């Protein structure tokens, strides 16, 4: 099966490399990027991200609910546009299908 866990790991590496300040909103704030895989808060977040991807593909994802939760953290369309680019890179590195359509679904509620 597609290794979404690896894709998500690359996604977070790209995301926080381009926008380090985004990492301050998470429970793994201040943690060195190359050590995130050993951080408990990160493992949980990454797992939830993998879950969301599988839910989007599976057809059970609640894009409206995810958008509202992100608004609840002062995360908006701009951040999601930035994320879209990082995820596109991360998918490509693993021969995985692109996920822009799923981010578009979220953006449609931001
Ligand atoms: C491809 C784009 C993204 C996806 C698929 C995604 C997915 C998720 C998921 C599944 C959760 C958990 C929600 C829950 O538990 O109900 C979450 C939480 C969160 N997301 Fe994202 N996200 C994305 C982009 C971003 C960006 C760009 C930011 C920028 C700051 C961000 C900030 C957060 C924060 C602060 C949380 C809560 C963390 C915590 O509870 O400690 N997200 N995200």
From Swiss-Prot:
The record's listing under PROSITE patterns reads: GLOBIN
Question: What are the residue boundaries of the Globin domain, all occurrences included?
Answer: 2-110
Q: Which Pfam families match?
A: Globin
What residues bind heme, as annotated?
70
Q: Does the keyword ATP-binding apply?
A: no
Which controlled-vocabulary keywords does the entry list? Answer: Heme, Iron, Metal-binding, Oxygen transport, Transport
CDD domains the UniProt entry points to: Mb-like
GO molecular function of the protein, one example? heme binding
**Domain of life where this protein originates:** Eukaryota
Q: What does this protein do?
A: Acts as an oxygen store capable of sustaining neuronal activity in an anoxic environment for 5 to 30 minutes.
**Subunit description:** Homotetramer. Self-associates in the deoxy state. Seems to dissociate upon oxygenation.
In Swiss-Prot or TrEMBL terms, this protein is called: Neural hemoglobin
Q: Which organism is it from?
A: Cerebratulus lacteus
Question: In the record, what lineage is assigned to the organism producing the protein?
Answer: Eukaryota, Metazoa, Spiralia, Lophotrochozoa, Nemertea
């Amino acid at each position: 099966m597609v290794n979404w866990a690896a894709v998500v790991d690359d996604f977070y590496q790209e995301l926080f490399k381009a926008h380090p300040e985004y990492q301050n909103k998470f429970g793994f704030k201040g943690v060195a990027l190359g050590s995130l895989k050993g951080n408990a808060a990160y493992k949980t977040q990454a797992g939830k991200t993998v879950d969301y991807i599988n839910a989007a593909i599976g057809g059970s994802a609640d894009a409206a609910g995810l958008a509202s939760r992100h608004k609840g953290r002062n995360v908006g369309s701009a951040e999601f546009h930035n994320a879209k680019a990082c995820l596109a890179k991360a998918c490509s590195a693993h021969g995985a299908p692109d996920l822009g359509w799923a981010i578009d679904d979220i953006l449609s509620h931001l």
